[PDB]
Amino acid sequence: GFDPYAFLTHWETGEVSTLPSGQTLREFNIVAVDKEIEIAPGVYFPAWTYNGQVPGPTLRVTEGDRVRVHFHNAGSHPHTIHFHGIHPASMDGVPGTGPGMIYPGESFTYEFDAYPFGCHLYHCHAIPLKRHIHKGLYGAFIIDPDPERHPEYQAAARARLLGTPENQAWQEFVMVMNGFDTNFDEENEVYAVNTVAHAYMKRPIRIERDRPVRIYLINATEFDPINSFHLHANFFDYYDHGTTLTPTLKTVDTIMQCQGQRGILEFSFNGFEPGLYMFHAHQSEFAELGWMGNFEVIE
Amino acid sequence: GFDPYAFLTHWETGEVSTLPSGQTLREFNIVAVDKEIEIAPGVYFPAWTYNGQVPGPTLRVTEGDRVRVHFHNAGSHPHTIHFHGIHPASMDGVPGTGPGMIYPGESFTYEFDAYPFGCHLYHCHAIPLKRHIHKGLYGAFIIDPDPERHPEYQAAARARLLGTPENQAWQEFVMVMNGFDTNFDEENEVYAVNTVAHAYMKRPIRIERDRPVRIYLINATEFDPINSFHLHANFFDYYDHGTTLTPTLKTVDTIMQCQGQRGILEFSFNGFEPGLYMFHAHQSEFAELGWMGNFEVIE
Amino acid sequence: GFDPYAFLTHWETGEVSTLPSGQTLREFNIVAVDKEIEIAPGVYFPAWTYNGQVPGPTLRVTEGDRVRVHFHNAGSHPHTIHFHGIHPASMDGVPGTGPGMIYPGESFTYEFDAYPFGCHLYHCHAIPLKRHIHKGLYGAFIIDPDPERHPEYQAAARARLLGTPENQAWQEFVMVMNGFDTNFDEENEVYAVNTVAHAYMKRPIRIERDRPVRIYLINATEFDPINSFHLHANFFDYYDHGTTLTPTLKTVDTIMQCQGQRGILEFSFNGFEPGLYMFHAHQSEFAELGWMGNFEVIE
Amino acid sequence: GFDPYAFLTHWETGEVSTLPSGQTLREFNIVAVDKEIEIAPGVYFPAWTYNGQVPGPTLRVTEGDRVRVHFHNAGSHPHTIHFHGIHPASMDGVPGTGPGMIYPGESFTYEFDAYPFGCHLYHCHAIPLKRHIHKGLYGAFIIDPDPERHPEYQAAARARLLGTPENQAWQEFVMVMNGFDTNFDEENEVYAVNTVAHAYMKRPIRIERDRPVRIYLINATEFDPINSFHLHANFFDYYDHGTTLTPTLKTVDTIMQCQGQRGILEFSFNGFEPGLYMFHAHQSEFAELGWMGNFEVIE
Amino acid sequence: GFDPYAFLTHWETGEVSTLPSGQTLREFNIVAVDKEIEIAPGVYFPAWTYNGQVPGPTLRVTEGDRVRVHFHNAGSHPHTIHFHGIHPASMDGVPGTGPGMIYPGESFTYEFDAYPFGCHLYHCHAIPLKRHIHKGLYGAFIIDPDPERHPEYQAAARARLLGTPENQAWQEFVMVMNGFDTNFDEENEVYAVNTVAHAYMKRPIRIERDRPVRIYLINATEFDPINSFHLHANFFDYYDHGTTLTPTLKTVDTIMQCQGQRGILEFSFNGFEPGLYMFHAHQSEFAELGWMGNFEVIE
Amino acid sequence: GFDPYAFLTHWETGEVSTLPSGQTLREFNIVAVDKEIEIAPGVYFPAWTYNGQVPGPTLRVTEGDRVRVHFHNAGSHPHTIHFHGIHPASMDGVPGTGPGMIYPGESFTYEFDAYPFGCHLYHCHAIPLKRHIHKGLYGAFIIDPDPERHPEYQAAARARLLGTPENQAWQEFVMVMNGFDTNFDEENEVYAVNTVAHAYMKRPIRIERDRPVRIYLINATEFDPINSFHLHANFFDYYDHGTTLTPTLKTVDTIMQCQGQRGILEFSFNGFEPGLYMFHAHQSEFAELGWMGNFEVIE
């Protein structure tokens, strides 16, 4: 029961509390479990998943928070969670430091402070590297800027901070470019944004004309060197890794990312004729094989 | 029939008039035609073309112009023109909106305002996507900045506006990186800039060293993930998508683009010894298979 | 023979003298020689080398120096040295200009002024292009900025000028990403940083926590379109081609480069827990096949 | 353009003059140009040619003549002319000695005295060797014996000196055995004598019964180790390389040649019943694929 | 059926009579018949044969004889007999002259004067060429010199004329090098002299020490470009095509022949220690696959 | 270990003694041993060798000498030495006669009188034939003519008899054409003269112009049917097997040999312009893969 339509706007913000220092603490529970997933109606893929879904839960925190991820391995192979983000070596989720890999039946709690602000990700780093990523163990990790730490860009920070009135004006979506090699010969058969091939052709993403749009776009695609995003009929600002509050690229319509790269796209359909506006990879075969969608811009 | 040496400096600026508001109107005529093209002497490729040539005509307009492209399909398969540019959904040249695909014998007029300024392209977007681009349906679309709209970068803007005395000082060239899969197994056999393999090795591009050089560089290569440009013995400024009037990358000699990406390169051979200065893909096999040329810097 | 641990910090600065004009002169001796190299214990590769090592010697000069490279070919095939840098056409090291290719038994002196400051490279450009690069004829070429020529970024420039006290505070490493196709079918079997697969897993690179780190990172990998660099648990500033004194990308942890691209990475492990901090390509299979290493952060 | 029937008896004897020493000078003009050639109706091959034809012009001079060949490269790849004959090292047409390869736009004059008398050839010797020969850069070079220098064999010498009454009685043909690999996988698809498969089946070579026949037979076929000539219903004398005035083999009907070998065949159909007399490779598949022809013996 | 030991010394000399003019006439009857042959015990090959054997009957006549070969096709495909020898075009046994191909149930008489003396062969020349030869339609054709016509070489002529007392002193053998492609993919599986793989290893050829040896050696091997003969521990004189009475090559132990070539080998084991003396192709795999035998030199 | 430059002129002439009859005895010690050889720097080939080198020692004796070759097998597989020369069956080095094969740890002394004079070779003849030759078990065997036995050609014989003043005036070289199948699929990857690919491009063979040149040329190449020798810019006389004192072929520049064939080439660069003069296989791919060298003709 994975819903690629609910997934677009679903932020896991954790079990929240306040540490005695005043620092906010966000706790998450993540279980690695072997599970069937469906990448097109009637195409089943044997996944290794975080919390039973591919991509894993989108974790969204604020710059400066204390993050605790309680990780339990209920699968059949050893796994980790490697975060893209600042943290100690022993919290890195690689086989050779800290606890090492987390074996079936074992549990381990990752702890770190949420730095730097931007758009990040997490994925398994086991043996061999490409196998555990391909099987499904990846997800989005978003660290909102703390507007009080960035007075020179306060308005931009507030528009990214989940729950502010500025942020509520924005239509924010998370999008993970992934692919699936169904016969396990290291070449992808199926491509997608958020797992389900052509999911947003069957059901376009509804966009209010008068509100700006922000995409947190992440490349999790294995085996292929790059993936890309082309926005039809409109241009966006791109923020590489989302780690700056001013754009990396102003006014582009096609960007590319290798695996592990990611960023923030901001654009607006304000004043456009209502209708369907396509977005897809500019690797033509990826689009043909499932990585193509529509925005539905409404009055 | 196709001349890669004339193509370098050929701009189609259309039939000009004015709308009652005073907005400038530019009108173009484009016909899809199945046609033989020659990619090396004695290598014939069965192309789908705009106006009988690959790449199609370079269309060049001013920021804010109203553009009308009368499109007629005189071929055997349905086709479109998808512009990289701001326009309404019904004008997007995709199968699912407006008039959909344009079938043999049919016509349609694409109409939009020319935004944003920069270096862009157009190409077919039919079914399947990779087949119609590979067969030859792509071309360059340049939108000159309007200097009145950019007072803070007026000199930079005037140097890009076709016809000003500042623009006449520059030596401007169009370069489309393409490739050809002559046995149709989805792997290119021939690579080129402007279609004819090694055309600018056979006859180098003559460059007056006292005037600066601007290249509008577009990647239309299908099947391969990236293409690139290495300038020998010199460095250029790179403007990604051409959509800013300040450089994206200062002082580089090798840049890469996935398909659909493009940009502007600016450099000068002022003070250099006269001679041959090579430019080519830094994917070594591409350069060996045709994507290599020479500038001839003259006293 | 080749010591990948010593290579990290080895700078070849030449025989120094003064031209009549007062310009500094730096002279180097490079011999091409066919030689066995070891890319893993017991894996021998039949290489074409500069001075008997792959990568070739790292040449490091100052912006504005006069550079003379006395090149002798002691091999069995014709070779050149093509520098990425500003120089006359006849000094470009390509087959069709100046002296042409340097055949076995021949000698030629490449001479030019060292511009522009940045992180660069040199490699053979013979026939066909991919064969001579793959076989091992590539090396790093670093042009330090002259701080007297950059008053607005004097401190940034002095930290890059080899030998200043500011520069001695930095821990600088040169890293060439390369690959080896041991059965010569144009797909790599082994990937590495600095030739020896997993060299820096076997013996981690020791990093003092209290001092910043600079990496001159170069992509010499053939056949594959891109290579990349992921820093675990930390973020870096990226200077594309090293040709600016301000960062191209602020605060990233994954960058990619096509072949011939290169840049400077700057980061610090100040304040971090001591331990092992991984770095590797984010093309997962490259990392599995040798392009993976550890920094050892010490108190 | 290419006429294999005219080619059989076409001799380029140069522009003739006398040097101050009294020595005869013969000058030739040869241009390398990329061009389509037709190896069978509707089979187009992308060729590299000398003067727009494959095989190149048949050059015929006299023992002791001074030969000047003005060579110009109007193609896109570097090329040479390597003559099989006696000449200085700097005139040998190999990479790396003398001028080396002649790059696009360059010119060079090959100059030597014509020795030794016999049947020879010329072909490109660039990198790699097999590519430039296969692409079409080969031709016949015939040095007639000077009858005054061979008093013991004066009648045989006079019969080979072009234009004497003894020579006019002989029917002389040049035949270049060649092949074409149209999908460029290093295995020939088409075989022929003088390029056009089965040309002399479609139109037999008319032979006058009462006049002897001389063939200058050259093997330019690439990739295959040997080619051969079988004369039906008759026997010939064979002169290996044509360098002696008495036969190498008396009364044979099948000879073989590796590439670069060549010789003179002499036979007579005097007394034979008029009709069609076949000649072809005795590699049966070569004959099936184009290397088969007929002599038409008429009363 | 086929006896390779009897084949060695079996000469078919025809039905002899005298024409009114006094010229000797020799008549032969040859039937093309489809038949199994055994090329190794238990390896059955579907052959097309002359008179039910592969090789066909060895025909041996005298220079100047009138030869009449009555040919009848009892097979299922059309066939010819193409003699290597002098004859009218209408008697050449090729599809396009005379009676053309002889279809099933048809007949034709080949008629010619036996010229020139030497070692020759006959084989089918139908469509396609390689198929009919490979299937088995080839045989030896020997024309003895008439000693009256060769007074200068009368002893050598007489030693070759079948039946003279000088000829009886010689040990004369016919040997046809052939091969078989049992899965019909155009590459031989089996090689032999006289069809049966290793027949003369199983049963060596008995050689009297005190008498010289002569071999009529013919290459009928299809698909492979050359075949060869190496005589162990001894040297022989080679007569190319047998068409001269003086050796082509003196004192050799390895000769090669393309298909259709053939000749005469003469040697003596006089004074040699009795024992086994090997002879085989010097293409090693041919020897391994059946083309290897022993001479048994007896006191 | 192996030195291809010293190998060119190294003659193993044996330990000499006098038999009671007065006949000269030349004894040689040859050990078969498995050893690595280097066919290019970093290309290691697992060889079966005579005395630790490929080719084996060049043995040079005089016609009529008694030769004893003490052969010991220190390898892992059975081996022999089969000489191309006259000798008894029991001394012929084949599996079925005399001692049979020499198994690991066994020894055998080959003995025979050295006949006939000429250029010969020796090689293993075990099971299967091609595998032991390819692995490296072959060498040159040269029998000088005894001038006292050839009074009609006494001058030619003295110039071949090693050590005479006439022989000192000749420049003599031994060249074995060989090849290597490094992945053991029965097709060669590397070709050479004297094992090391392009050895004489790296270091040309120095040739004086006032002395003529003699090459003992041997074809040991497995798998391929023929190999060849082309001399640039000059012509030579060829002596097939070297078994005559007059040439087989006068004035040729390209000869071919199947495996086990060999001969003597004589030429002179007297009066030539000093320079580099190429020599190589006219099978273009063999030359590209290592069988190419230069003569350095000096003033």
Ligand SMILES: [Ca+2]
């Ligand atoms: Ca508190």
Ligand SMILES: [Ca+2]
């Ligand atoms: Ca797959």
Ligand SMILES: [Ca+2]
């Ligand atoms: Ca108006």
Ligand SMILES: [Ca+2]
């Ligand atoms: Ca293809």
Ligand SMILES: [Ca+2]
């Ligand atoms: Ca490989």
Ligand SMILES: [Ca+2]
């Ligand atoms: Ca040179």
Ligand SMILES: [Ca+2]
């Ligand atoms: Ca082919």
Ligand SMILES: [Ca+2]
């Ligand atoms: Ca077969």
Ligand SMILES: [Ca+2]
């Ligand atoms: Ca092989």
Ligand SMILES: [Cu+2]
């Ligand atoms: Cu895992």
Ligand SMILES: [Cu+2]
């Ligand atoms: Cu990662």
Ligand SMILES: [Cu+2]
């Ligand atoms: Cu289309």
Ligand SMILES: [Cu+2]
């Ligand atoms: Cu596009």
Ligand SMILES: [Cu+2]
């Ligand atoms: Cu090189």
Ligand SMILES: [Cu+2]
């Ligand atoms: Cu480069």
Ligand SMILES: [Cu+2]
């Ligand atoms: Cu060429």
